[PDB]
Amino acid sequence: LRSPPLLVGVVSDILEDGRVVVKSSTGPKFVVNTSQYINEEELKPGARV
Amino acid sequence: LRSPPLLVGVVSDILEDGRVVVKSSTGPKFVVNTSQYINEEELKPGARV
Amino acid sequence: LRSPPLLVGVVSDILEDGRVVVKSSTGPKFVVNTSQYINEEELKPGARV
Amino acid sequence: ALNQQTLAIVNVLPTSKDPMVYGFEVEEKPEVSYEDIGGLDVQIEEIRE
Amino acid sequence: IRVVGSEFVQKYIGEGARLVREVFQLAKEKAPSIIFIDELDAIAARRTN
Amino acid sequence: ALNQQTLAIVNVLPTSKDPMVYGFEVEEKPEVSYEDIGGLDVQIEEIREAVELPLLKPELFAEVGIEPPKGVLLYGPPGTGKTLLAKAVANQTRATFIRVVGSEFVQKYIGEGARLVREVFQLAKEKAPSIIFIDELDAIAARRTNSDTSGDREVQRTMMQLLAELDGFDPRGDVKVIGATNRIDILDPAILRPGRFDRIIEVPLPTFEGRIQIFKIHTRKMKLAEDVDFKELARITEGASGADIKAICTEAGMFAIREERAKVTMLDFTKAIEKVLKKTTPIPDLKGVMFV
Amino acid sequence: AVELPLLKPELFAEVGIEPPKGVLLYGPPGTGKTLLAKAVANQTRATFIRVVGSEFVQKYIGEGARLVREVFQLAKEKAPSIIFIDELDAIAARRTNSDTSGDREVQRTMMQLLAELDGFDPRGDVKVIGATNRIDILDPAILRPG
Amino acid sequence: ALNQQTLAIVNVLPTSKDPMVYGFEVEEKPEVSYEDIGGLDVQIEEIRE
Amino acid sequence: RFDRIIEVPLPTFEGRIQIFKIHTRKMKLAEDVDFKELARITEGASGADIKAICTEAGMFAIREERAKVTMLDFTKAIEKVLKKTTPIPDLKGVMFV
Amino acid sequence: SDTSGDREVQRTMMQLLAELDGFDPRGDVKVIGATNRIDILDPAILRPGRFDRIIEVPLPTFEGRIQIFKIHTRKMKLAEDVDFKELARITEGASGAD
Ligand SMILES: Nc1ncnc2c1ncn2[C@@H]1O[C@H](COP(=O)(O)OP(=O)(O)OP(=O)(O)O)[C@@H](O)[C@H]1O
Ligand SMILES: Nc1ncnc2c1ncn2[C@@H]1O[C@H](COP(=O)(O)OP(=O)(O)OP(=O)(O)O)[C@@H](O)[C@H]1O
Ligand SMILES: [Mg+2]
Ligand SMILES: [Mg+2]
Ligand SMILES: [Mg+2]
Incomplete structure (x- = not known):
């Protein structure tokens, strides 16, 4: 899954439910979880993903 | 109701090959083909098709 | 092959790596092959294809 | 509302959802009244005519 | 519908005329309607000779 | 949260911490009070009564009978300090100061954007007392065409969203809306609508007494030997702004370095x-030859 | 004005004054506003940021802002540093009225620029050195020193 | 150049684009050319220099 | 930004004469075209004036079937x-020559 | 300069001067230009090299009016007491549309 092709976005917002609001460069935002070893503590808005 | 939708565009250019170019309201240009009851005699200045 | 649907492109330039740079009307730019029916006499920057 | 499959008007929704005014300032049924006018007493009566 | 007199005229004109046409049209769609026209001094002046 | 493949509403609710605007307050109060600002002095009274007072109490203003301002615009030649005054408001409210530019509200695509305008006012309402300062506006106070097509539509949508909002959370103080404009001749109604505003404060270039106070505060941080007549200098620098009076301090001091003081x-x-x-x-000049 | 507080903040501190926030250069064209700017760049030695004041304003609204916001943020990190913006007459030109989606974009990008310079937002030690072709074609914010 | 569907770098294309109708016309030949070298002779000497 | 600033004004006395040779050469022989005489009549005319004169001399040629x-x-x-x-014009001054 | 209806109307004139001849050849044009008055025309259009023959179009002469008349009469059905000569005398100082 970490294999290409991958779409670049940035974190918009952090929400109270384990998920981060992600605004992709294409357009639309998505509410999706991080990974296990990627945390919301590590992530920050403006953090490129 | 089950009969299809029809994408509106405006005739971009007249080509002398039996094709006609139509700029689609989607954004792109596509080169399209006439029927046996729409002829060049049904094309005028400001042709919405 | 030649039959509809057809897509508007414009030759942005010719590359010597044996590809041609074409700007699609759609968006994506792509480097693409030519055949024996196409001449490089035909090809110039800005040639509709 | 159009059916996304093949596009056809399948539900007529209420007009403009919901109507919008412009030409600012716009005051439909102004909060100022004719008992809000005093001292300009006989002028109330003339504009009513 | 309130039109101010500071929305009237420019030093080459058309936008001043356009918003007058607009509220008249809109008044026509929305009748009963009262078009307030303050303040005649920037679109009404005596004819300099 | 919507199902992008079932088309049923999954979850609800603005949770809104909300990062996109979070960094925009609180400013932990600026270092600039009314004490750190010179004399005006009557227009000082005007801001405190227009802004701070209705904010703690739409009740006392209601009891009276009066209506608090719809919005407050600060206007004047640049360097009086309009955002300087706003820092002062920030220091005496003891609160929230939402920092965002009107340049970021006009954007090139859609419900970035629109949502952002509504976000700035939701944010004010919960963090209150507040106090939204946005910032020197001319561009939410543009003119429409219907339409020159990329610019206008955006500016027209965000203008309606702006004015409607401020009207409706202040019949009465709850969120004070403050702002500034530098030039007010260059613009076509939006904020120059009197149904949307009613308090325009003229921020004047400083009084004869005002100049002396400005000079004074500037030498306070600096070091001096007592011989400086602050009153005299103010006489010479009539027709200037307050910022110039700083530059003269700073420049006097650069001269002092060159003299070795x-x-x-x-x-x-x-x-x-x-x-x-x-x-x-x-x-300089001239004595002649012929004027002697 | 610039090399003295970069290399040595001290003198200004001893008196109790503040250095410059910028320097305005004007004059007649050909007087060496840009030659002197390539000169000073060898001598600052502090990260010379070169942007051109005519690369600003697009068909996009807000995109101009994006660009000013990004140079000032980069300058804070690099500070002390020089932001030399070649044209104050393309993002800082003088108005008459809003007209509409061209002229108006000029004051939109200019509004972004004020703001960052030191309107509310800390500079570090930047030091925007401007330059313009004509003497007057400047906004009153920029004409006023400060 | 990138890969068809996996997207991955396979080639390099020249650094700098796009020469269309911005400088590909390198015409310097007749009939507007040095047909007249008999000017207006002095100005010509200056360009040559 | 240039350095070599060139004013290119109306052709000089000698300058017009040269222009006529190049054009008259394309249009064959003429053992009675005095290029110098042409200049005297044309005193002070652009490079494109001289060319239109050349076009129309060809036209008068074929209208006489030469x-x-x-x-x-x-x-x-x-x-x-x-x-x-x-x-x-025909006002030289009544107070000047 | 500094207008917008009489500065930008010139920056599309300047593209034209300039594809007719210019660095841009020729072709087979031969541009037939037409204007009502030349009192609001730039001298660059007016000089030759492009617009080689500057052809004024006059007001039709005596014989001129007669020719015009009969073109118009030809389409009508007429009487044989119709004498053009007299009519062209009265209508001296007139264009063809009149
Ligand atoms: N009354 C004063 N007391 C102290 N400092 C002052 C005073 N007036 C001006 N200044 C100084 O001048 C600068 C303030 O003017 P500045 O040009 O930043 O702001 P503004 O009036 O909000 O203008 P703009 O219209 O450019 O946004 C600050 O450095 C401030 O310290
Ligand atoms: N004091 C100087 N002494 C020597 N030559 C100089 C001096 N200042 C400038 N020049 C020369 O003038 C040239 C052109 O001016 P320069 O490049 O300094 O532009 P500028 O004043 O910023 O102009 P523009 O208005 O065109 O942006 C330089 O390339 C250099 O040759
Ligand atoms: Mg300010
Ligand atoms: Mg320069
Ligand atoms: Mg030319």
């Missing part, structure tokens, strides 16, 4: 004014 | 071009 002197202010004044309008 | 340009064609064509372009 680590305090500032009356000699240094006379020289600093002389630089500024001279560049306007001529000062 | 196969080459002679002096009379140039006279007719110079006469047409200069008349339109833009005629000599």
Whole structure:
């Protein structure tokens, strides 16, 4: 899954439910979880993903 | 109701090959083909098709 | 092959790596092959294809 | 509302959802009244005519 | 519908005329309607000779 | 949260911490009060009564009978300090100061964007007392065409969203809306609508008494030897703004370094004014030959 | 004005004054506003940021802002540093009225620029050195020193 | 150049684009050319220099 | 930004004469075209004036069904071009010569 | 300069001067230009090299009016007491549309 092709976005917002609001460069935002070893503590808005 | 939708565009250019170019309201240009009851005699200045 | 649907492109330039740079009307730019029916006499920057 | 499959008007929704005014300032049924006018007493009566 | 007199005229004109046409049209769609026209001094002046 | 493949509403609710605007307050109060600002002095009263008071109490204003302002605009020649005054509001409210630019509201695509305008006012309402300062506006106070097509539509949508909102959360103080504009002749109604505003405060270029106070506060941080007549300098620098009066301080001090003085002197202010004044309008010459 | 507080903040501190926030250069064209700017760049030695004041304003609204916001943020990190913006007459030109989606974009990008310079937002030690072709074609914010 | 569907770098294309109708016309030949070298002779000497 | 600033004004006395040679050469022989005489009549005219005169000399040629340009064609064509372009005024001063 | 209806109307004139001849050849044009008055025309259009023959179109002469008349009469059905000569005398100082 970490294999290409991958779409670049940035974190918009952090929400109270384990998920981060992600605004992709294409357009639309998505509410999706991080990974296990990627945390919301590590992530920050403006953090490129 | 089950009969299809029809994408509106405006005739971009007249080509002398039996094709006609139509700029689609989607954004792109596509080169399209006439029927046996729409002829060049049904094309005028400001042709919405 | 030649039959509809057809897509508007414009030759942005010719590359010597044996590809041609074409700007699609759609968006994506792509480097693409030519055949024996196409001449490089035909090809110039800005040639509709 | 159009059916996304093949596009056809399948539900007529209420007009403009919901109507919008412009030409600012716009005051439909102004909060100022004719008992809000005093001292300009006989002028109330003339504009009513 | 309130039109101010500071929305009237420019030093080459058309936008001043356009918003007058607009509220008249809109008044026509929305009748009963009262078009307030303050303040005649920037679109009404005596004819300099 | 919507199912992008079932088309049923999954979850609800603005949770809104909300990062996209979070960094925009609180500012932990600026270092600039009314004490750190010179005399105006009557227009000082005007801001405190227009802004701070209804904010703690739409109740006392209601009891009275009166209506608090719809919005407050600060207006004047640049360097009086309009955002400087706003820092002062920020220091005496003891609160929230939402920092965002009106340049970021007009954007090139859609419900970035629109949502952002509504976000700035939701944010004010929960963090309250507040106090939204946005910031020197001319661009939410543009003119429409219907339409020159990329610019206008955006500016027209965000203008309606702006004015409607401020009207409707202030019949009465709850969120004070503050702002500024630098030039108000260059614009076509939006904020120059009197149904949307009603308190325009003229921020004047400083009174004869005002100049002295400004000079004073500036030397406070600096070091001096007592010989400096602050009152005299103010006489010369009539027709200037408050910021110029700082530049003259700073420039007097740069001269002091060139003389090898680590305090500032009356000699240094006379020289600093002389630089500024001279560049306007001529000062030396002539004695003749024939005028003797 | 610039090399003295970069290399040595001290003198200004001893007196109790503040350095410059910028320097305005004007004059007649050909007087060496840009030659002197390539000169000073060898001598600052502090990260010379070169942007051109005519690369600003697009068909996009807000995109101009994006660009000013990004140079000032980069300058804070690099500070002391020089932001030399070649044209104050393309993002800082003088108005008459809003007209509409061209002229108006000029004051939109200019509004972004004020703001960052030191309107509310800390500078570090930047030091925007401007330059313009004509003497007057400047906004009153920029004409006023400060 | 990138891969068809996996997207991955396979080639390099020249650094700098796009020469269309911005400088590909390198015409310097007749009939507007040095047909007249008999000017207006002095100005011509200056360009040559 | 340039350095070599070139004013290119109306052709000099000698300058016009040179221009006529190049054009008259393309249009064959003419043993009666005095290039110098042409200049005297045309005193102070652009490079493109001289070329329109040349076009029209060819036209007067074929209206007389000639196969080459002679002096009379140039006279007719110079006469047409200069008349339109833009005629000599006739007030020199009554207080000056 | 500094207008917008009489500065930008010039920056599309300047593209034209300039594809007719210019660095841009020729072709087979031969541009037939037409204007009502030349009192609001730039001198660059007016000079030759492009617009080689500057052809004024006059007001039709006596014989001129007669020719015009009969073109118009030809489409009508007429009487044989119709004498053009007299009519062209009265209508001296007139264009063809009149
Ligand atoms: N009354 C004063 N007391 C102290 N400092 C002052 C005073 N007036 C001006 N200044 C100084 O001048 C600068 C303030 O003017 P500045 O040009 O930043 O702001 P503004 O009036 O909000 O203008 P703009 O219209 O450019 O946004 C600050 O450095 C401030 O310290
Ligand atoms: N004091 C100087 N002494 C020597 N030559 C100089 C000096 N200042 C400038 N020049 C010369 O003038 C040239 C052109 O001016 P320069 O490049 O300094 O532009 P500028 O004043 O910023 O102009 P523009 O208005 O065109 O943006 C330089 O390339 C250099 O040759
Ligand atoms: Mg300000
Ligand atoms: Mg320069
Ligand atoms: Mg040319």
